[PDB]
Design a binder for this molecule. Structure first.
Ligand SMILES: *Cc1c(COP(=O)(O)O)cnc(C)c1O
Ligand SMILES: *Cc1c(COP(=O)(O)O)cnc(C)c1O
Lengths: 376, 376
């Protein structure tokens, strides 16, 4: 094995107690792909151009469905050539960014608590990952608290709103502040918008809808959660021309274009399923309302979720995230995601996925409320 | 842009004269995906597990279809966990290998003339690419002619039989020699078996069917050309456990598993289409026979193709590969692949794809034979 790869901690998500298992460690809604997307994929398989190698950077109709989506969704004007890069699932693009953008020894700020997969990308590019310390209840950056020396050396920053695992959301103004802090520096921003569709009390803002957003940032959007297409492996990067062009160049070397039929299904999804995205957000909103109501009534301490598909729950005293994870699976047959892999600041929380039977979730709630005595 | 990415020469394949255009610069057969593979993909889209995230390293049935294929095809016994890694199209896996296997400053031997895409992988891993000089008519390695100092420093070697662009084939014995040369050294081999199905006068051998093959090498196999599934993006690596495990680890960080429905279509292909692979080889065999007959009769100098889908044609005196490429498109409306991007040793050849209408190919032949006067 190479030294570079040896450095990389295993993908943390790469047995149960007596009770029937409830797996609340799941990303991703439980629902099927809308039938219309399925029907169009089925049809796209019979198309001669779809069976064969195509243009590396994607169909014109795909690039166009992307800019159209961003325009009517976020009033963001994008150029199809300069400001759009199709991704083979967003994980692939997110982990590619540092290789494309930074040089050995460059500092990269990573949200703590934040998403697990970024670290690998930084390490694959010989960068130096440094935590962006986010604090409850709202987990927003505090740029004045980042060491002045680190800010100066930072060439890339990941942001994630809605945040995985904390469910925290951003506003136009918090993006304004980030952009103003780093415009005219060599620091760029990657905003991971995987949960863009899931905004409970307010539609989540794009970083690119903030004035000057494209000057500092790209935004990465996934079809996985919004459209129940997680297994399909399709997303896109949008924004800063320089960053987009570097990604595009990287993908001409590591890939030979996206499956044409997958592109057509993606086009169909983006063009026709705005209402469904709304439906998805609403379904998780109430799922959240019911689950957090159960928790609050039994005085279990949690951080209220503002978007995404999870609740960020405190561990009780005398349990860390991994001890509480093992407790819940052993005693309660509830699988949760421990806060630890999400960063140091996740040490005393667990992540709970609401992406299961609107049924199951109720039994899981009653199971958890029984543990109220642990929090005294 | 990052320094690392800036180093990488553009993907060379990332206007016409008066005559109707014949594009002989194409990889990939012209035929459709067999209907049976299509039907099973269509059906696989409706399967709940296929629409969602699955196991990173692939379905058991896929791992099993791979080992079964290798067993009945090449009498090679493989372990499903230890010796099989599914690839998102082989290009992705081929370019990943150096990142997984070598360290900065390690030498990697690349076939000259050989495939275009390897160089990027080496450079992405900060390795030092060095040409493996192959000579006509047979383009086989001569290990005694590699500088003793280079061999000692080499940690990885790419081999490609059938070779792209030269169409050269290997034998069990040439693999025996390679394995004996590097067994017990820290040099590993990656054999690119993209044209495994296309063996004209003899079935192409696996490097893993040679005694001790798995001790030094992995072999990478693609469904693109064999099964007319080039746009689908599916292949696999097979062999050396250490190398396979490094690739598998790399793919847990850069990916989240292969589309389940794509896996099912791939399973179906591997399990049921041995005869079709034979058919494909035979179709290109005769296409080659007819085209090379035309060339030989008019005394146009070429290297006889033994496998793959191309003919490797000499440029006439006073034209290099790029000048001859421009000549053919301008004057003859024939697009060819210039030898140059395939290496220094391709400077005075062009690559001609037989992957077009069994019709077209005849007109392209007569167009080319008219140029016999240039070779005097
Ligand atoms: C889901 C997830 C991803 C990965 O999404 P894919 O497009 O399916 O690879 C990236 N970032 C966050 C925050 C996620 O939750
Ligand atoms: C076709 C080609 C590849 C790429 O194959 P994919 O699986 O479609 O990415 C790799 N090596 C050689 C020699 C090729 O001709």
């Amino acid at each position: 094995i190479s030294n570079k790869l040896a450095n990389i901690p295993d993908s943390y998500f790469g047995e149960h107690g007596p009770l029937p298992l409830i797996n609340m460690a799941v990303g991703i809604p439980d629902g099927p792909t809308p039938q219309g997307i399925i029907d169009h994929f089925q049809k796209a398989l019979t198309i001669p151009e779809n069976q064969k190698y195509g243009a590396f950077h994607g169909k014109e109709a795909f690039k166009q469905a992307i800019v159209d989506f961003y325009q009517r969704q976020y009033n963001v004007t994008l150029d199809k050539e300069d400001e759009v890069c199709i991704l083979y699932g967003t994980k692939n693009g997110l982990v590619a960014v540092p290789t494309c953008v930074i040089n050995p020894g460059d500092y990269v700020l990573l949200p703590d608590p934040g998403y697990t997969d970024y670290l690998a990308g930084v390490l694959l590019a010989d960068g130096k990952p440094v935590p962006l310390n986010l604090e409850p209840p709202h987990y927003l950056p505090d740029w004045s608290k980042v060491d002045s020396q680190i800010i100066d050396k930072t060439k890339l920053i990941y942001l994630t709103y809605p945040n995985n695992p904390t469910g925290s959301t951003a506003t136009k103004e918090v993006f304004d502040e980030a952009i103003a802090k780093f415009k005219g520096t060599d620091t760029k921003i990657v905003h991971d918008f995987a949960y863009g569709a899931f905004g409970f009390d307010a539609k989540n803002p794009s970083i690119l809808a903030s004035e000057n957003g494209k000057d500092v940032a790209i935004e990465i959007y996934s079809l996985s959660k919004g459209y129940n297409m997680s297994g399909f492996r399709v997303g896109f990067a949008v924004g800063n021309k320089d960053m987009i062009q570097a990604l595009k160049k990287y993908q001409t070397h590591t890939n030979a274009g996206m499956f044409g039929a997958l592109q057509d299904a993606a086009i169909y999804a983006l063009n026709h399923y705005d209402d469904f995205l709304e439906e998805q957000s609403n379904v998780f909103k109430t799922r959240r309302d019911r689950f957090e109501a159960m928790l609050a009534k039994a005085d279990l301490p949690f951080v209220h979720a503002k978007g995404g598909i999870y609740v960020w729950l405190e561990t009780p005293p005398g349990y860390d995230s991994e001890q509480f994870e093992q407790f819940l699976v052993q005693e309660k047959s509830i699988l949760v995601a421990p806060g630890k892999p999400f960063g140091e600041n996740g040490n005393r929380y667990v992540r709970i996925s609401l992406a299961l039977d609107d049924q199951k979730l109720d039994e899981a709630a009653i199971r958890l409320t029984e543990l109220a005595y642990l929090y005294e």
